[PDB]
Point group: D2
Chain length 212, copies 4
């Protein structure tokens, strides 16, 4: 598409998008155009409003577009075109991406003892309620664990809530400990969001006992 | 995919899918698997049920799956696997497609007079509330009108309701009537649903006057 | 979206779209904008052309857009905006839908004899190479058969060619003949395209013998 | 879905997926099922093979599935089910995600001089050829720059190649430098891939002059 301001909008929270160049109050020659999961191609919204879209997005007195509670289907492109008093046209172009932050990740079914030289199920990490899905990763003594290397293997599962569409992730870690290692290793799991500059979330550690 | 029974389910109505070969009442060794717009890949549902899916679909005493009110996101594949008292396993495979019937189509902005040898806007046909979209067509004295032939031209528009996802269609007919024709032609518009074996819906006719 | 001329384009065939209002030859102030399965949102194409898109769509001397061989990914919206010599702006808006016609449908594995009062597999109808999928239906003595009524049942299967994306459909008919019926019924199968005003295709008939 | 091994497969490279529990060589009771961008729901592949799928994926002598050159449409789920000599059944479940690494990112149109207290276009960063899209980010003297804070603003653009589907990203940085700052700041841009554990790519720095 074209150059846009990129906007990240949390599901369930309001969103206000500015119509650049609009007069501060009516009268206003402005039009919003949106192409989102709610539209077939472009929908035009005007300051007069009306109809079903008044339940979703309305133009404010200052020309900004207001959504009271963003949902997954609002992801897309939002554009404004305004004329000011002198007649200069100004365009605004926004790319809206939506997200939700899951609960703190948790480790369930952790092993209290591990045996060297055979595979052991260390635990299952679980994260509930994210959008977009994001990813789970395992760490040993603070350091990321790379699957399929050093006797490490991981299996993963994704499901979605049938009404909200939010993701639940599960990640099961198996390790084949090498003889001679630290008998009290510290494992942990982290959730990394799909969108950039969002913080990772991490579990409490587990410290199983390894028997040589 | 595999061979399945096709099921056509009206939006907002209940749906009961039978689990072939299940015992008539509990105890029952059976399992449903669904891959629909509500799932990431397959979801398994069992007679014990539980969790968020209990708000969407539950297994009945006789083993059938029940949805109290189908939505667009329930389109997809539904399978049951059951063992009877003797141990014969029986599979059921359903492909569920959902639909909604729009209101009666209407013609708006119809012309009361037409002029031979020039293009005239005959009218705009509108249909509100269909799923899947379906199509609009124009008829002259009962016979379908073919666009881009005999001075006929049509333009079309599709919108979706921002909350229900249902389609509204609009179709604008222009005709350049030829000199020497019927001075009182009868036009009408019909809505043809997307799904097979469903009846078309037709507008009342309009009978403009053609001036030579 | 907005009002558009609806265009149906056969896969593998060229497509020429007119830029209304363009001068007949260069110089030309015109721009094409496309949003199709090949684009992220809108792509702009100009008479100078250039780059990868020259392998897909180019602007002709008269301003029309030319695709030498349409594919599934070309389905979408194509718009032109032109200024003429006087400076009048003219917009063209096209909604392009693509299709392919399958081979003649065929019945395989047909029954030569049927037995009254029990279920019989009449045959399997097969259609290869359609886009969009379209549907298969069974007819008895010219009259459509309605599944789940009068001892009729149908199962269906859809697959896609892994490289071309075209659909193959299969439809298996079972009938439980009622005692006292015509001992030499005539069955046939028809393919109905997904797009409007396209002709149905039908199989040769089969005439099994019914034993009372 | 179910628990699976995640597989990350580079576009254009071969992929071999193991069928756990298969005999080392024929005879072999095993079957692969795939649901990818090439299939309508599940496709079954067998050691005998045949048809169009032989051009895409084949079962090897040892039972593994081989794709000679992965594409975007091979993203999806791949499962094998095998019985050994004794009759133990073993399942393998793989979730295949595909990727491509773009060329080194580059800054174009960089500013050689900046003026304090007004907005300046620092440069445009460009990355060509990624899958999935990934993201571009700006850094000042090694630290990430956060948009809409401290006189920083960014606009972004995404295009796809019309034949390969690979992404090109562009990111334009504007800064209003504050009076009193470093007169020789160092800016750079980095590409962060969509998939986890893949390395970022970074541009050479630019060091404009700031005029107080
Ligand atoms: C000039 C104008 C009117 C009007 O005054 O008729 N409405 C508008 C909506 C968007 C953009 Br740009 C310009 C206008
Ligand atoms: C108070 C109000 C006015 C007005 O003062 O005219 N217009 C609006 C448009 C959208 C939303 Br939400 C609130 C208002
Ligand atoms: C082409 C375009 C851009 C851009 O290139 O940034 N922004 C816009 C905002 C509103 C409308 Br209406 C059109 C555009
Ligand atoms: C997109 C979406 C919503 C929503 O838009 O609210 N709800 C869902 C429930 C299950 C799956 Br799968 C996807 C969704
Ligand atoms: C044997 C069996 C159990 C059980 O072990 O009780 N549960 C089941 C669910 C579906 C199908 Br088919 C078979 C079974
Ligand atoms: C009444 C009832 C029983 C029961 O009697 O055990 N089980 C159920 C499962 C689904 C729905 Br809906 C209703 C019932
Ligand atoms: C699929 C769908 C639903 C639903 O599933 O309720 N609602 C919608 C509103 C607008 C657009 Br576009 C699509 C949908
Ligand atoms: C005026 C004009 C130029 C130009 O002469 O600079 N190029 C164009 C492309 C599309 C449309 Br409408 C108008 C123009
Ligand atoms: C011959 C030719 C000219 C020219 O004569 O300048 N321009 C073109 C643009 C597209 C395609 Br396809 C063919 C031509
Ligand atoms: C808004 C619009 C329509 C319509 O409403 O029919 N057609 C177009 C053709 C080209 C460009 Br650029 C914009 C439009
Ligand atoms: C859309 C499509 C193409 C194409 O665009 O050529 N090829 C395919 C092969 C299998 C499946 Br499923 C879909 C496609
Ligand atoms: C028993 C068996 C046959 C056969 O009957 O020879 N083919 C198979 C393919 C996959 C899996 Br698990 C088991 C079998
Ligand atoms: C050489 C060969 C055999 C065989 O030796 O039987 N089977 C195969 C299946 C797939 C691909 Br690729 C190569 C082979
Ligand atoms: C998925 C894809 C392919 C491919 O699978 O080769 N090619 C493309 C060209 C443009 C756009 Br948009 C998407 C694709
Ligand atoms: Cl819409
Ligand atoms: Cl799910
Ligand atoms: Cl693009
Ligand atoms: Cl398929």
């Amino acid at each position: 598409g074209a150059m846009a301001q990129n906007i990240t909008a949390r599901i369930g929270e309001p969103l206000v998008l500015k119509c650049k160049g609009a007069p501060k109050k009516p009268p206003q020659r402005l039009e919003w155009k949106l192409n989102t999961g709610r539209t077939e191609a472009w929908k035009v919204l005007s300051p007069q409003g009306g109809g079903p879209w008044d339940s979703v997005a309305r133009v404010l007195p200052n020309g900004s577009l207001f959504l009271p509670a963003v949902g997954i289907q609002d992801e897309g492109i939002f554009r404004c075109q305004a004329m000011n008093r002198n007649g200069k046209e100004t365009k605004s172009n926004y790319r809206v991406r939506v997200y939700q932050i899951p609960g703190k990740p948790e480790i369930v079914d952790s092993a209290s003892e591990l045996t060297a030289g055979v595979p052991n199920k260390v635990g299952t990490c679980v994260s509930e309620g994210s959008y977009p899905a994001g990813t789970l990763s395992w760490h040993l003594d603070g350091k990321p664990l790379v699957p399929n290397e050093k006797g490490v293997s991981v299996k993963e599962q994704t499901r979605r809530h049938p009404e909200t569409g939010l993701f639940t992730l599960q990640s099961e870690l198996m390790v084949t400990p090498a003889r001679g290692g630290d008998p009290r290793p510290t494992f942990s799991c982290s959730f990394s969001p799909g969108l950039p500059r969002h913080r990772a979330l991490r579990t409490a550690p587990i410290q199983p006992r390894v028997w040589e």
